[PDB]
């Protein structure tokens, strides 16, 4: 059972996240800069890949 | 004691290093087997890997029929000569070193086995005990 409501619940935490290109760190969806200070707070992000 | 080994073997004394020629217990054409490696051995500088009763080893037939010669293949030890202690208490040793040839699943290629076979080897390998004659 996928269940329409409970699928959207789990996808909020697992799927709907951005990722930093330099350090591969997980980030919030509408962020502008990476929070890690090792990569120098870079502004080069992308969306996490969709499943099929 | 691993490649399709039904059960676990308690430690025993190591009789056969690499370079030893044990006899061939089975009746599949081969006469004697030159051990080259031990399946499931450790690694320490300078130490030769040493087989024992019930182990599986890589062997080349030196003396025997021409089909079995010149191809590395697996085998199982069935008699030792270096004595070992059993948990029951007694020490024991066979008269000579011997071993059957068998594919890596652990199944006998030969039909029958001549001479006695160890009880430690018989329990660890089911298909050896099927053709086995005397068990100790």
């Amino acid at each position: 059972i996928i269940e329409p409501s409970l699928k959207a619940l789990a996808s909020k935490y697992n799927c709907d996240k951005s990722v930093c290109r330099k350090c591969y760190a997980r980030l919030p969806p509408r962020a502008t800069n990476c929070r890690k200070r090792k990569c120098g707070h870079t502004n080069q992000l992308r969306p996490k890949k969709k499943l099929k | 004691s691993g490649n399709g080994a039904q059960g676990t073997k308690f430690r025993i004394s190591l009789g056969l290093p690499v370079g030893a020629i044990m006899n061939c217990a089975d009746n599949s054409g081969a006469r004697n087997l030159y051990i080259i490696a031990v399946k499931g051995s450790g690694s320490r500088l300078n130490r030769l890997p040493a087989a024992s009763l019930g182990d599986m080893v890589m062997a080349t037939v030196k003396k025997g029929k021409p089909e079995l010669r010149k191809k590395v293949m697996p085998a199982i030890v069935v008699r030792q000569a270096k004595s070992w202690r059993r948990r029951d208490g007694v020490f024991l040793y066979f008269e000579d070193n011997a071993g059957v040839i068998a594919n890596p699943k652990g199944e006998m290629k030969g039909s029958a086995i001549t001479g006695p076979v160890g009880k430690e080897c018989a329990d660890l390998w089911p298909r050896v005990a099927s053709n086995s004659g005397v068990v100790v």
Binding site: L9, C15, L51 | -
Partner: protein, 191 residues
């Protein structure tokens, strides 16, 4: 640029009565009591007329003035917590293996115990903090309800339960299995 003086305004309702000395904020009301040590912040509190309190900073920078507004929201949440209360709901998500959760005792400490998460033999104990009170919701399938005065405790207790059930060495996009936070609100209705 060094701001000459800045300030925010905490509005106190008719029920509660708050007390501050040095920077130790006691807040008492109908639900219970709360306390908070703020001796790391450097601010000034001032009373005006019972239902209004004025926080202030004098000759502060940019990062100093940022922490001023934080203190307002901390003391506000203590006031909303002791009046209305907090109520965090969470839901189970699974495909094949049904998760069976129950509250268990251990030296009178009270732990949440998760059994058979994704078909496992390990039993996952999670401690229950002081103040928070857990109960399983009847007439809604596979739901839990945490509640207490403090936000800091209730939310953190939900987060621990949330984070004890991760799937390791798998594609987390595919394996959507866990106990997730559904809705944050208050205990009492109306407000």
């Amino acid at each position: 640029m060094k701001y000459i003086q800045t300030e925010q305004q905490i509005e106190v309702p008719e029920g509660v009565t708050v007390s501050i000395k040095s920077r130790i904020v006691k807040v008492v009301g109908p639900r219970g009591t709360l306390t908070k040590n703020l001796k790391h912040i450097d601010v000034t509190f001032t009373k005006v007329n019972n239902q209004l309190i004025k926080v202030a900073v004098h000759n502060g920078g940019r990062k100093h003035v940022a922490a001023l507004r934080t203190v307002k929201s901390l003391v506000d949440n203590m006031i909303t917590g002791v009046t209305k209360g907090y109520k965090y709901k969470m839901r189970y998500v699974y495909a094949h293996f049904p998760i069976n959760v129950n509250i268990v005792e251990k030296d009178g400490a009270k732990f949440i115990e998760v059994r058979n998460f994704l078909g496992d033999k390990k039993i996952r104990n999670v401690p229950v903090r002081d103040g928070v009170t857990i109960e399983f919701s009847t007439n809604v399938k596979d739901e839990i309800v945490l509640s207490g005065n403090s936000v800091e405790d209730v939310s953190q207790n939900a987060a621990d339960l949330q984070q004890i059930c991760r799937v390791r060495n798998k594609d987390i996009r595919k394996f959507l299995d866990g106990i997730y936070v559904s809705h944050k609100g208050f205990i009492t209705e109306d407000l």
